[PDB]
Design an enzyme around this catalytic site. Structure first.
Site, short mmCIF file in Angstrom:
data_model
loop_
_atom_site.label_atom_id
_atom_site.label_comp_id
_atom_site.label_asym_id
_atom_site.label_seq_id
_atom_site.Cartn_x
_atom_site.Cartn_y
_atom_site.Cartn_z
N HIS A 190 12.37 5.64 7.72
CA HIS A 190 11.40 6.41 6.93
C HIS A 190 11.84 7.87 6.93
O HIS A 190 12.05 8.45 8.00
CB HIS A 190 9.99 6.40 7.54
CG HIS A 190 9.22 5.12 7.35
ND1 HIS A 190 9.67 3.90 7.80
CD2 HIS A 190 8.00 4.89 6.81
CE1 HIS A 190 8.77 2.97 7.52
NE2 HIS A 190 7.74 3.54 6.93
N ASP B 210 1.65 8.82 3.52
CA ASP B 210 1.35 8.47 4.89
C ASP B 210 -0.16 8.35 5.06
O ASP B 210 -0.91 9.21 4.58
CB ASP B 210 1.92 9.53 5.84
CG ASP B 210 2.11 9.02 7.25
OD1 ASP B 210 1.13 8.55 7.85
OD2 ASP B 210 3.25 9.07 7.76
N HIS C 262 10.29 11.39 6.29
CA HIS C 262 9.03 12.12 6.09
C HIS C 262 9.25 13.35 5.23
O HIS C 262 10.21 14.08 5.42
CB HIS C 262 8.44 12.59 7.42
CG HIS C 262 8.11 11.48 8.36
ND1 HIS C 262 6.82 11.00 8.52
CD2 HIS C 262 8.89 10.74 9.18
CE1 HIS C 262 6.83 10.02 9.40
NE2 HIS C 262 8.08 9.84 9.82
N1 LIG Z 1 -0.78 1.40 6.69
C1 LIG Z 1 -0.02 2.51 6.54
N2 LIG Z 1 0.06 3.18 5.36
C2 LIG Z 1 0.81 4.28 5.21
N3 LIG Z 1 1.52 4.83 6.22
C3 LIG Z 1 1.51 4.26 7.44
C4 LIG Z 1 0.73 3.05 7.68
N4 LIG Z 1 0.91 2.70 8.97
C5 LIG Z 1 1.74 3.62 9.52
N5 LIG Z 1 2.11 4.54 8.60
C6 LIG Z 1 2.95 5.71 8.81
O1 LIG Z 1 4.30 5.35 8.79
C7 LIG Z 1 5.06 6.40 9.45
C8 LIG Z 1 6.24 5.78 10.15
O2 LIG Z 1 7.18 6.78 10.52
P1 LIG Z 1 7.83 6.81 11.97
O3 LIG Z 1 6.68 7.13 12.91
O4 LIG Z 1 8.83 7.93 11.86
O5 LIG Z 1 8.41 5.45 12.23
C9 LIG Z 1 4.07 7.12 10.39
O6 LIG Z 1 3.95 8.50 10.03
C10 LIG Z 1 2.73 6.39 10.16
O7 LIG Z 1 1.58 7.20 10.16
#
Ligand SMILES: Nc1ncnc2c1ncn2[C@@H]1O[C@H](COP(=O)(O)O)[C@@H](O)[C@H]1O
Ligand SMILES: Nc1ncnc2c1ncn2[C@@H]1O[C@H](COP(=O)(O)O)[C@@H](O)[C@H]1O
EC number: 3.9.1.-
Lengths: 102, 112
Positions: A88, A19, A90
Site C-alpha cells: 500500500h 483509508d 499512503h
Molecule cells: N476496511 C478498510 N477500508 C479502508 N482502509 C482500510 C481498511 N482496513 C484497513 N485499512 C487501512 O489500510 C492501511 C494499510 O496500510 P499499512 O498499515 O501500511 O499496511 C491502513 O492505513 C489501514 O487503516
C-alpha cells in the site's frame, strides 16, 4: 462489517481507495493488483509497476487538491508498522505534516 | 535549480555513500531520525514528486527497488518505512526528489 471504500481510481495495474482510518484530511491508498506482500519482496520485474504506482499517487494527489503539499508513505514489516501484507502506498495531505514521519 | 544535493552528487561536499549507479545516488541523512536513515535520490534533478512525469516511470521504479535493496544491505530485516515529502505541507525542504528510508526502531503511526 466495514464501510465501502471510495475508490478514487482504477486501471489494469492498480486500485486507489480512501483509508477507513484517515491520518489526515485527505488519506488514500494506492495498491497494485499484483499482490506484492511488502516492498521488501518487490523484484526487478516489478520495476515498471512500482513506477506506475508512484505516478498514480501523484496524479491522484493533484486530483484530490493536494497542491500545497503531501506525503507518500510505504510501510514494511513490523517495525515499519505495516498492518496489511499487500503493498500500500499512503498519500496524506490537507494538513501540515510533521517531522520525523513517525 | 541546483540544491545542496548537487554538491553531494558532484562529491564536493562529503556524504556517506551506500550505493551509486548511473541513475541514482544513496547516502546517509546527516540529521537521522532513526538509527538507520538514508536518502535515495535520482541524478536527474526532478525537484519534487508532483513534478515527475510519465517518462520517469522506470526511474521511479528503480528508486524504489534501490531503496528496498539498500534497506536489506543495511540490516533492516524486521521492517522500515519509505517516505517522500512534497511541498510545504509535506515538509519538503530540499527541492530535489528523494526517498527517505528509516529503520532500526519501531516507527510510529501517524507518520507525522
Ligand atoms: N476496511 C478498510 N477500508 C479502508 N482502509 C482500510 C481498511 N482496513 C484497513 N485499512 C487501512 O489500510 C492501511 C494499510 O496500510 P499499512 O498499515 O501500511 O499496511 C491502513 O492505513 C489501514 O487503516
Ligand atoms: N549535506 C547533507 N547530507 C545529507 N543529508 C542532508 C544534507 N543536507 C540536508 N540533508 C537532509 O535532507 C533531508 C531533506 O528532506 P526533506 O525535508 O524531506 O526535503 C533532511 O532529512 C536533511 O537532514
Amino acid at each position: 462489517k466495514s464501510l465501502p471504500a471510495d475508490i478514487l481510481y482504477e486501471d489494469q495495474q492498480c486500485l486507489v481507495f480512501r483509508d477507513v482510518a484517515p491520518q489526515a484530511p485527505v488519506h488514500f491508498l494506492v495498491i497494485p493488483k499484483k499482490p506484492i506482500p511488502r516492498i521488501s519482496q518487490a523484484e526487478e520485474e516489478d520495476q515498471q509497476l512500482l513506477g506506475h504506482l508512484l505516478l498514480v499517487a501523484k496524479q491522484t494527489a493533484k486530483a484530490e487538491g493536494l497542491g500545497d503539499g503531501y506525503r507518500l508513505v510505504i510501510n514494511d514489516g513490523k517495525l515499519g508498522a505495516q498492518s496489511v501484507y499487500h503493498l500500500h502506498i499512503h498519500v496524506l495531505g490537507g494538513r501540515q505534516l510533521q517531522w520525523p514521519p513517525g
